[PDB]
Design a binder for this molecule. Structure first.
Ligand SMILES: *[C@@H]1O[C@H](CO)[C@@H](O)[C@H](O)[C@H]1NC(C)=O
Ligand SMILES: *[C@@H]1O[C@H](CO)[C@@H](O)[C@H](O)[C@H]1NC(C)=O
Ligand SMILES: *[C@@H]1O[C@H](CO)[C@@H](O)[C@H](O)[C@H]1NC(C)=O
Ligand SMILES: *[C@@H]1O[C@H](CO)[C@@H](O)[C@H](O)[C@H]1NC(C)=O
Ligand SMILES: *[C@@H]1O[C@H](CO)[C@@H](O)[C@H](O)[C@H]1NC(C)=O
Ligand SMILES: *[C@@H]1O[C@H](CO)[C@@H](O)[C@H](O)[C@H]1NC(C)=O
Lengths: 57, 418, 418, 418, 57, 57
């Protein structure tokens, strides 16, 4: 799995599953922008947990 | 009738031996190259305090009183109670704010004059006997504040070398940590650090320093011989192992070479610029180091989310030219009862000031060795046909020429027979 | 005439290559698995004092005055001379025995209230930022007295994990060792220990702690970063190597899993129950912890014969799922001159009490790695026939089919010829 | 037409496989031999001071006042200013030289009575419980002055052994370093050493001690458990690796066995005897230890050229029976507040003298293991013909018997045909 | 060699010879009970230094 | 390369070139006598930088 990180292609660890994208997860008085590799999806509003390569665009 | 019954015995051994190739097993080899020249590893060192006390002014207290963790959000001395009288007298005098007009502020300017200058930290730098000086230390910026770097290799100065072992053939740095000018800690926060010493990370020249997560510590009042033994690592590209062996331009957005430490800094720069266009002073880039009041809305929680995610948010892989450095400490008590009254007279300081604020690093190679640990692929393609022929030379006896002339056998079967 | 002369050249190479199999040679392979989750190793820690001074009573002094190494065998203060006045005043007052009626005694009850409670030793337990507490420490019993255990894995609590490197992602325990309440040492014995610090052993969850013979020490007044790097070992069963790989029920008389440490405790329990049906409080079993007066006849010399035999009396073998933990210490002086008057105010203690009785452990993984060292058999049975055919494919050319059809040659020799 | 086209495919694979032999590649194998007896490594230890202060006389000051780095070249106290009053009173009284007649001088006699006697340094030597004594320490001479050696193996005493792990089964040496009798350091030279502790090198019995360039340090006021784990190394002779494996008489001009440490001392002896027929007291030989006034012309700069050449002037190679010793320190603060007034009463010393000048070494094997790392040649001659036959058994099918009977084919070509 | 230790079968080290049994070796005001692997026999009264497997019963 | 060192034959390191001999290099109030392996020649008066084996006699 070789999906993106802020404009750089980066392979994941071979134990790690599908990656994701998020313009959310507020956590404070703020609205974060996250993108990276992952192992657990929590798709409610924008967590695009797509298991295809180069999916986060 | 039996040749069919021995071909399946060949086919089972051939299938496991072609699947043994698809495991990509690898063995590793350890040498001890008795080398004759060795490059000295770049020593960096940071004090455990971020900003000295006797070199902050009124406007620095007015603009970043909450980032200093010293003032109230409504601009007062919050818990000014039962700490000291000399600290408290100079505190309220530089925190009056009685018609104190503000000034233009810059955080990079604040760290250049309120950190720790090396001209009064260092007392005696040495290298193999010849007297090192103060301007050999390239200034760097990391999360503990202002930090220095011996033997950097950048900015035109070449990489120094060593050719002899033993304790007399490396650095001998008699530092001074100045415990009097630490920040007063009468408050209580989550980042509070009671300690007082130097964090020192030994690394090769290509990685930037990462004192937050890889450096050991050296206590004051104890000369610590720190041995070294240079290792070399060669890993393999996938699917044998993992490398970012393609070194044309992999991720070098602000550096030149690739390393596992420089991945995380380049990660945390590119993440923060995608949030509020800031960067801290320890973040290489081109976007502006942003204002202190802007740090409290966006720049503070965007990075404190990173220390709470309970995963490495930005992943990468190790390169395969890694040179680590194994270390072996030892301690000897420095300010001897014979040597007490000389150091207090020479450096013009008190007696009890000596036994608390004097540190002597001493870093040297032990034996001029080279412990290389490399990975080699254990079942190549050229060993496949070499080991496909041990059994067919034993089971059936047939060479591949008996199959190569079996093509010339087929001329009498399709042309002449049918 | 020559085929007989090349078969002996085959027979010599075949005999050495079948004896090379009977050596059972083995090579070993070292990897670095860049793992993503790692289980935290179970940290145990013991004070170097066995019984605190301010929590022993008259009957404890009457029943075990010689086991405490404080009293005379005819029940007096033996060498009460030139030690102290505050220690000596409280000593003779709790050693009057003027019509002091005895009480029922139990040694396990004595160690539960006269050891060191963790509620006043520990001051601040941490784990990755979130605040650890006092009831995460499973109490254990070993030879130094009462000892605690972080991250035990038994009694229902799961095994904690970590997923980030660096110094901020492990324990940060600000202990307190209470040097005032050590035993007075105005006597002189063979077991006398002048030191004052904590012994800490890092181990996996399956072995019971063995602080007597495997733990390092941490000095008070020095915060010690203790790095870690988890290793994994896989040994081989005999006759390749040695294992107790049969894990159905090997020797688990009082435990569940097998380990080289749990062998010696199970040894020293089963030996002592075969002598006077006792066991000490650090000995797991079901036979009763025996009376203090009975300890002096049988239980004391039966174990002091074990430390005099000049051999390991009870032998066993290592298992082959061993996980060691390599460590790399470093020290930083804790009670800073800026941070002196805060810790004395907060924990309600003196100033000079701070610089003697405060210890800060700090244990963390350095890089999330996995250094596996396993043994693999180097000449299996399936490589024997594969290497028996390299020479007969070269010397004589004969396959085994030429021997397999040599059975069909024998039909014309015993049936038709004779 | 095609057999010529498959022979070149054989010839390419045969040429690379005979050049693979000429690389002399080698793999290395790591075991863990669970041994039952282990020999104790020879511990040497040196104080960091060369000559004690209270045992030098007038003529020692008159003859070697400049070699002591205490006097003026025109025989005066050079910088006798603001050091002390008790040191300065005894100094000018033993440096009067008012009609002080000189005496016959000998440097070897000076080091035997002005160094550090072990009878007042050592307080309690132990070994596995049984009480070691003072005359087990063979006196040796190296560059720090007078140095001692436990478990030497020479002079008739056998090599001691150990058979149990753990901290209670090795040395427990309560030393005393006597900081009062160090040299006064009110001057300033290049060799000035402010420290005060013991340098201790653990080595096998065959190498002479080399404290200058291989030993760690142990600080006073801290009992340091020093673990050990015996390694064994087997290197290979050239052209596989490098050995001086010929051990008949290689370079043993003043020793018996060969070692990389004993090479450099034998070098620096043979070099200095070729310059002015001197030798220092730490140089084994037969030429006389020369006069102090003669040291200043020839013997001083001939050796100070050696520390300035920026190369190892005399080269040699490592042997291949090397036994190293890996170490892992840890520290525990010794003079406890419970144990202060006993040690001052017993050894008849002050209270503040205890916390500065008491050191407790403690060296012990951790687990009775044996970590052997040997080099084995990976492509021998007997594997060459074994791997030359995998391809000719596959490519052409021809055995060497088809070439061996090709000689019998040639009888019908040169005799009958022509 | 796989002889007993208080009711548990335990192999010895491959350098170690015959094992033994002893209801003796007084050493104090006591009469000990020993059983284990060994390398040197001192058979006076009860030191059954038998070199057979499972001999100590 | 196996040239001499004060009367002992000693092989050099395989990275190291020609060895030498010198009754010179004064450096102080003295006239030194040097002999060993090397990697750089500076032949002015007596630095016999000969690349043959056993050359320093
Ligand atoms: C990277 O590794 C290769 C193979 O070991 C080596 O030849 C090369 O010099 C290395 N490059 C750098 C920049 O270290
Ligand atoms: C030496 O220290 C004293 C004490 O503060 C000070 O008055 C004096 O100026 C110092 N000397 C120098 C050269 O800094
Ligand atoms: C024991 O080792 C085997 C082989 O490595 C492994 O699969 C298994 O999980 C291990 N068992 C335990 C309980 O650790
Ligand atoms: C704080 O220490 C003093 C001194 O002994 C004591 O009187 C007081 O009770 C202590 N406070 C608490 C809350 O323990
Ligand atoms: C040298 O090494 C050989 C081969 O390992 C060994 O048999 C021999 O005992 C060693 N000799 C000495 C003196 O250690
Ligand atoms: C003990 O120390 C005192 C103080 O110097 C001294 O007078 C006395 O002689 C010493 N005793 C012995 C036995 O050395």
């Amino acid at each position: 799995l070789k999906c993106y990180q802020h404009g750089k292609v980066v392979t994941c660890h071979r134990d790690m599953k599908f990656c994701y994208h998020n313009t959310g997860m507020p956590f404070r008085n703020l609205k974060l922008i996250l993108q990276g590799c992952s192992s657990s999806c929590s798709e409610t509003e924008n967590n695009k947990c797509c298991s295809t390569d180069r999916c986060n665009k | 009738l039996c040749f069919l019954g021995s071909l399946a015995v060949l086919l089972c051994v051939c299938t496991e031996r072609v699947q043994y190739y698809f495991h990509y097993h690898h063995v590793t080899k350890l040498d001890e190259v008795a080398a004759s020249q060795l490059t000295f590893p770049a020593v960096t060192l940071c004090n455990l305090n971020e900003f000295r006390f006797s070199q902050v002014s009124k406007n620095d207290l007015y603009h970043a009183g909450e980032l200093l963790a010293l003032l109230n959000n409504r601009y007062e001395i919050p818990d000014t109670q039962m700490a000291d009288e000399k600290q408290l007298e100079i505190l309220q005098d530089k925190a009056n704010f009685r018609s104190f007009k503000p000034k233009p502020f810059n955080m990079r300017e604040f760290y250049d004059r309120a950190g720790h200058d090396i001209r009064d930290m260092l007392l005696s730098c040495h290298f193999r006997g010849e007297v090192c000086s103060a301007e050999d230390f390239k200034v760097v910026f990391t999360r503990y504040g202002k930090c220095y770097t011996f033997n950097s290799g950048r900015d035109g100065r070449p990489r120094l070398k060593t050719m002899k072992g033993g304790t007399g053939n490396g650095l001998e740095i008699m530092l001074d940590i100045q415990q009097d000018e630490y920040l007063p800690v009468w408050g209580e926060t989550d980042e509070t650090s009671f300690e007082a010493g130097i964090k020192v990370q030994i690394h090769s020249q290509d990685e930037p320093p990462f004192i937050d997560q890889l450096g050991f510590g050296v206590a004051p009042g104890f000369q610590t011989f720190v041995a070294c033994q240079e290792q070399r690592l060669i890993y393999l590209p996938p699917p044998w192992g993992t490398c970012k062996a393609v070194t044309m331009d992999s991720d070098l957005d602000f550096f030149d070479s690739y390393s596992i430490t420089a991945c995380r800094i380049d990660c945390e720069t590119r993440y923060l610029v995608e949030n509020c266009n800031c960067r801290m002073v320890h973040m290489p880039g081109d976007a502006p180091y942003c204002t202190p009041e802007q740090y409290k809305e966006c720049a503070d929680p965007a990075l404190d989310f990173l220390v709470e995610k309970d995963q490495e948010y930005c992943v990468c892989e190790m390169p395969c030219n890694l040179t680590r450095y194994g270390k072996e400490l030892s301690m000897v008590k420095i300010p001897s009862k014979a040597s007490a009254k000389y150091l207090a007279k020479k450096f013009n300081k008190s007696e009890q000031y000596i036994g608390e604020n004097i540190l002597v690093l001493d870093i040297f190679f032990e034996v001029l060795n080279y412990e290389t640990i490399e990975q080699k692929k254990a079942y190549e393609i050229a060993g496949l046909l070499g080991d496909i022929g041990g059994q067919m030379g034993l089971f059936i006896g047939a060479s591949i020429l008996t199959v190569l002339e079996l093509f010339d056998y087929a001329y009498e079967v399709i042309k002449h027979k049918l």
